[model samples]
Every structure is written in structure tokens, then in C-alpha cells.
Target: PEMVRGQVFDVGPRYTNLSYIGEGAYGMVCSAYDNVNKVRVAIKKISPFEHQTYCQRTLREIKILLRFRHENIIGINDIIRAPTIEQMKDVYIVQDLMETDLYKLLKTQHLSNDHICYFLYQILRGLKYIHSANVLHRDLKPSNLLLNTTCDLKICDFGLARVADPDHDHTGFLTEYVATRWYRAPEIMLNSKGYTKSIDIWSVGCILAEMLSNRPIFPGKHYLDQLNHILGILGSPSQEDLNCIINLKARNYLLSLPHKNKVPWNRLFPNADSKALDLLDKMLTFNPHKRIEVEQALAHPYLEQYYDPSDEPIAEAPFLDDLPKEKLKELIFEETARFQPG
Candidate 1:
């Protein structure tokens, strides 16, 4: 039998790589060095046109990456794509390279309060920019959190809400179920149309809980199970709380569940300090309206040491929505052509 080998292309103009750093949602990612500047960068080679969903998600991510410029948000340095004659090959998105992600870091190291404070602070800072942009990260587990030895952190992988159906198949719910089950907010689980930026806040709350406990705070087999998992710990929503839910059916279902008593935050995060627990309580609220905003979360005593007034945005960022499919294709192609080998 004859052997067939895969052909490889350079990551992009001014950069080269023989191996990849990781494989992401729609692409293979690699580390490359620019010949001109001699600086390392991570490149993601994605075929945005492979699927309609993929195309939309890729454009949304690109929109967020291009517009956001913050210490805590990952930045895209360059983009390159195959020539039009190639039909559909790949688009390379280049950005800063980090040594590890928070998921990997959390698995290998026991994080401290100091670590937690700084990490959470950066996450909120990034979310502040994202929310201001009228964008919902939708998915923000540890793996999307990029980090370096210097403890600098950057949020990556925006708006990838198309995770596989849960073990219970969202129980005939809408397909827009975003966020990993463990970090999913109750509002999202109920498929609430009113679910807003507070969804990200809920995810951050779950991550913070995991950091202190060194395990997922709500590990459930399915979406409904996840609600039980959350209620098991945080307790069932009261009648007034149910009124906040716009989904009448979901609200009724939750009301029929067995009553649960709230667990003490200190018990849940035994090692967490009083202030840290206090912030956690505010973030994990069942009602989105009650969840703490990033600005207020930053001001909480737990983050006092890491807070900077400058980190907060002076004005709300204007909304940036996804473009028409053809427009997105043309825009990225134009961006890509700029980096084509000349």
C-alpha cells in the first residue's frame, strides 16, 4: 500500500510553525515567530465557511477580538487566509502566545486567595469590556482563560455557544444553551429570553467557587440535573424569585420542586475569607437582576487589593453586532489579503 502524507502550509506571512499549541473549536492553533520582529505569536487556522454556524461564530469572535483592547482580553495581531482560487482552505488568526490556560493551571497548581483575587479581577475587567460591547461571552470555562507565568490573564474564545446537547438533551429546550453545564447560570438553563450579560457573571461565580473548592461547584449529568445541583447548594428560589423569571412554564416547574435550604458560603468554600464569600454570594444569585455588576464586584472587599479605578470603562462601549454573512466573508477576506505573501 502506498502511504499518503498531509501537506502543511506556513502559519502566515512573516511567521512559521512546525507544530501547533492546541486545537480549538473551529481550528488548529500553533505557535509561530514573526521573521520581521522575532516575536512569538499563536495562530489559529480556522475554516470559518465550513458550516453556517461555524461561519457566524467565527465572525462574532473576530468582531470581539478586533474591537476589544484590554489587559485582560486576548488580542488578535494578524489574520491570513487562502487565496480565492483555493475555494475554501483556511483563515489564520494570530495573537499573543501564553504558556498555559486557567483550566490547565488549575489542574496543576493549588491556587491561593492571592491568586484567586488577581485572576477574578482580570476576568471581571475583561467582562466589563465585553458586556460594554453588548456581547455575551456565553461560554467562559477555565479552558478559555489564557495565562502566563507572570500571572497575566486574558479571556479568549468569545461567543462559542454551540456546545453539544446535554445528557438530557436540553429536554426539548432551545439550541442556544450556552456555557458549560458546570458553570451555567440558572437563567440560561431555563432558556430565559431575558438572560443577559449576567450570564457571564454567573459563570465567573461558578469558576470562583471551583477555584476555592478545587472542583466544579455544580457537576451535573444533565441540564435539569444542573439546576438541582445548584439548588442543592444555593437552595430553591422563593415565590418572589420565581416572579422574576419571564418563562412562566420554567418558573412553575421550579416552584414545584422540593424546598431546599441555602448552605453557608463558608461551608461551600471552607478556606475562603468572609469578604470573598460575600462576593460569591452576590454573584451566584438565582435572579439575574440581583447579580452584582462587574463594577460593584470589583469594588468588593475581596478584590480591594487588586482594584484599579482605571480598569473600569469611562463609557459604555457601543454595541457591535454580527454582520451579514456575505459582508463578514468579504471583511475577513480583506483582512486576510493584507497578510498574503507578497
Candidate 2:
């Protein structure tokens, strides 16, 4: 189904009437039955005041969305733009609706091992696909991830996202803090000289920690306080780690509160499984150079062994082995040759 009268056309297996789903930093998401197809659709509408830039982001996202279509990522149904008056444009996006996100579901407790697989597998795959397209999801947190009826995770909100190069110049400027406070990488926090694809990897680590423990990995109040919380377990940044990172924050320092020594993650996660700990080490490394890439992450011991595409009967695994051998070969070749187009 397509767009009709500024609303989604087909309501899949449901009735009429739209209901509020949730809101984000700059937009509100709603749930409506499409009346035509009978399935509920998620509608995302940015604040009117943010129309110009929102429209650009929406279009760029559409191009990126079109080039790479996969089950792991949220499917874009249609983009509806209302008649725009000078200097302001009304825009909305339609997508398949889901109940909630991994964050909300975790309110109960650390997810069971099965649920963890259900969530992270999709997230890893989604992240992998975006990276494959040479795009950076700059913002990546559980809040921007939604869960469908089958419990598969879908990433949303690409407003702060940017396409990255083999080297994305992080020099003294970060357009926006894409990932929320908890999932934010240390380099982003420190205002490092260079930002790379590792940013999402850092967030993935945080998400994995949150899921395994059923508690937030690092929940801090202030910047310094947050660093301390992380340092307490991850240990202080090593000189080498510190050196690889170039400080880019506008001058502001606390002589009395300089960053200090290394600590042990086990101090924080006393009961985490070894599988969980091994992956966490690679993800939370202080040096950006040492950070794991998404491709490597897909093949990580933790995910490779446990990922079951067929886990949820309703969830259609995006990349599978049943396809023609030639088509699969082409995908492998493409990934092998991917790079930052200069």
C-alpha cells in the first residue's frame, strides 16, 4: 500500500483510528491501522520547526534506504510531504509498526538468553548493512531501535546520521551526539580528533552489556561522572589509548579532576558470562584503533555461534544461505571490495 491523503493507505489486518506510539528527541511516532491492508503502520513526524533539515535528512535516508533493502533494517513504506508553505515543509514517514523497543522490554529484568539473541542478532545485522552502504548511523541507542511482532529489532531515527569515509574527520566538530548518553563511545565523550565507524561498535558493546546484565552498562549523570563510572570497571585509559585519541573539545578542564588509572570490568560485572566478557573487551577498548569493526563483529565468536536466523518463526532472516550460489558469491565479493569512496 502507498500514501493517500497524507496518511498510509493499507492498514494490515487491523482497524481504523491512529494511536500514539512514542516520541523522540525531535519527532513523534504514531501507530495507525492502514484500513487498506489491515496492518498497523508506524508514522514518524518531525517537529514543524525542524522541517527544512528534516526533509533533507528524510530524503537522504530514502536514497540510502533504497540502495540497501534488508529484513534487518526497518522497511520504509512511504514518505509523505504535505503542501509546504514558504520556509516550512510538512513531512511524515510511514513504516511497519511494532509494540516497543528493547529498552522498554528490559524494564522487567535482564532479558533471557533467547531474548538477547532475538534483539542483538537483528541489531548487529542492521548495523552491518548500514556499514556496508558506507553510511554511519551516528545515533545508535536502544531507544532508536524498535521491536516488531516477532521481536526482531529495527533501527530508526537517522537525522544525526552521516556517510563516513575510510577516515571521517572528527577534527573539533561533532555535528550531533547520535547515540544517547549511555551508548555514546568514549571518543565522542572526550571530543576526540577523529571519529570513525567505531562509534557504532562502541554503542553495540553498551547494548550487549545492558542486555546481558539486564541493567544499563554505564548510567552516569555528568560527563566526568560518566567517565568515572566506565573507568571504574574498564580501567583508566592507557597512555597509548589516550595518545591515539586527540582531544578536540573546546578548552575546558578541571585540574583537580584529571582522568586517572585503569580498572577491571569484572569489578563492575561480577556475574557476567565469559562469552559476554570476551565480546565486551573488544567493544569497550579505549583506543579507537583497537575497536572492533562491524564486519568483524558479525563474525565474532559470541554472535556467529549463537545467531539463529530462524529463532523467531515470524522474523524473516534478511541474509540467508538458501539463495542462488552466484548471488551469494556477489555479496561476498562486494563486501571484500568495500571502502570509503574518495
Candidate 3:
């Protein structure tokens, strides 16, 4: 089926909205059935702004998602933008529509130990590809993970993504509130400037704990409350660990609190196997430097048999490669215009 020109109102031509799904990062989200491809896709409508920062972030996300060709990572089917006299048109990112996300799937308590391992294995597999490309997902909450009944998963949303530089640390640029509060690492809470890729690993640990208990490990009301909840189980870091804090105010505040003793993993996860507990413990370390790296965590005994080097995702050169930002924007405009008459 060849695509025809479409309108800015109904989102048709190549695709037409079948039903409203939910609110996305941008605006209205809908389950659109593509007439040309004969498949349903999730389309998120976002306004393209003239703001330099916004433009740069949008460009980075488009480039990254376009380049990524992975089973575990969400695929970008197409980017659609409608023209306007105002020059600021809304851009829609089209991707596969999954039946539900991890957040919704966890509601029924249907997940088993096997489900846990398989789901987490895929998460790590996706993160492995992401981290290997020097990309920090920054945001790793359950809501950000998409899934279907088969237990297939994909990592989505690159709004807060950052590229890691080998020659320099960008901790100064790393925000303390980058990730959702509960899954954030101690380094983030302590405002550590030495934050690294391990920040993401710590987030995975939180997600793991949530899966085990059917509740968030640290449900904090505020930044300080987040720290208190984390300290409640992991206990207060050693004075040496607190001493390592570069921020004087954060260090002093921790020293002021009673030294909470570590709660054993066995106590926290009464029914979990030792191997699972071991891996969880490694991910939730109080020290960012000590948190297990993605590669090592993927190889842990708990992950067993799931580790396959050949299973790793491979990246392809983005079709937009070598195209200037303005040129890319023009191409996106043309792609959407093709559907206008439909």
C-alpha cells in the first residue's frame, strides 16, 4: 500500500488513529493502524521547538533511535511532522505498539521467578547495547520499559539520555534528579560529581527489588526522604564511604544521622534464592563505584545460561547520517507531507 498525503488533524495517510491509548512524553498518544504497512504503531506527538537545547536533544534522540537496531530496544518505525505556517510543527515518533508496559504488567502479581529472570535478562541485554554505545539511559523506571505477553521487552524514551566521554567526566552536568527518585543511586542523592555508568546499574537493582517484593524498594517522598528510605535497608554507608563524598553538605548531613546498620538481603528478600539476592546486593551498593557494571551483572550466576555474546544487538548507520540538522528536518517534513491528501 502506497502512502498518500494526510492531514494534521486525524493523523492518517500512512497511518490513522484507531483509538486513544494514553498520554505520552509529548502529547496525545494513540493506537494507529498503518494503512500502508498494515500494522498498529504507537505515535507520540511532540512539538518541535526553536529552543537550541530542545532541538539538540530532539536531534540526538532521533539519531540514536534511528541508529539502534536491536530486539531489546524499541525500534523507530518512522518520524512524522506536519508543516505549519508558524514553522514550528509537531513531530510524531512512530514505534511498535506493545500490549502493555512493565508497570501495568506488575499490577496482577502474575510474574514468577522465571518471569523475573527472563524480563531482567532482556533489560540487561538492552542496557548492554545502550551502555556499550556510551549512552546512559538516565531514566530506567518500569514505566519506561515496554513489553508484551510473550515477555519481550524494549527500552524507550531517550529524553534524558547522555553520551559518555572517555577522556572527561561529565558529573558536573549530571543532574541529581535525572532518574525517577526511588530508582536513583546514592551518588545522585549525595550529589556526587563522580557519577558513572553504574548509576544505571543501581536503577536496575531498584527495579529488581520492586519485582521481588511487588513494591518499590525505596518509596521516597522527597530527595532527603529518598536517602532515608535507602539508608533504612542498606544502612548508613561506612564513615569512610561518607568521607568519600565530595559534597561537604551531603557528607555532614549523613554524619548527623544515626549510623543505620546493614539489613541482610536474606531478611529483605525472605523467599528469594541466594543467587538472586547476591546479584541484587551487588546492584544496590551504597558506593556508585562498587555497583556492578552492566556487563558483569549480565554474567552473574543469577543471569545464568541467558548470557550469549552473539545475542548482543548490533547498530546500523542511521539513514540520516551525514545529513545536516536542517536537511533532516526538511526530510521529516517531506515524509509527513506525503500523507496530507489521505
Per-residue C-alpha lDDT of model 2 across residues 207-325, encoded as one tens digit per residue: 88888776888897755456556766676566566555455342232122466655555666776666667777888886677988776666666676655444422222221224443
**Candidate 1 TM-score, C-alpha based:** 0.87
- Write model 1 residue lDDT over 186-244, tens digit each, in one string: 77667453236777889999988888877888999986688889989889887788776
Candidate 3: which pairs clash?
A: 4-339, 5-338, 5-339, 5-340, 5-341, 5-342, 6-339, 6-340, 6-341
Model 3 weakest 10-residue run by lDDT = 1-10
Against the reference, the lDDT scores of all candidates come to 0.75, 0.62, 0.74
Off by over 4 Å in 2: 1-15, 49-60, 83-89, 166-178, 191-194, 246-263, 306-342
lDDT of 3 by residue, 1-342 (tens): 222233233355677745667764355666788888888888766665644444545666776787677888898787666455346466777889988888887776657888889888998999988887878888898988899768799988775677764344334313467688888887775664323688789889999988887888999987768887889999988867776676666777787888689989899888887888999999999987667988888899998869877776634421223455565555445445543455
What TM-score fits each model? 0.87, 0.74, 0.84
User: Model 2 residue 165 lDDT?
Assistant: 53
Output the lDDT of residue 135, model 2.
Answer: 69
Collision count for each candidate, in order: 0, 20, 9
Instruction: Give the RMSD in angstroms, all C-alphas superposed, for model 1.
Output: 5.1
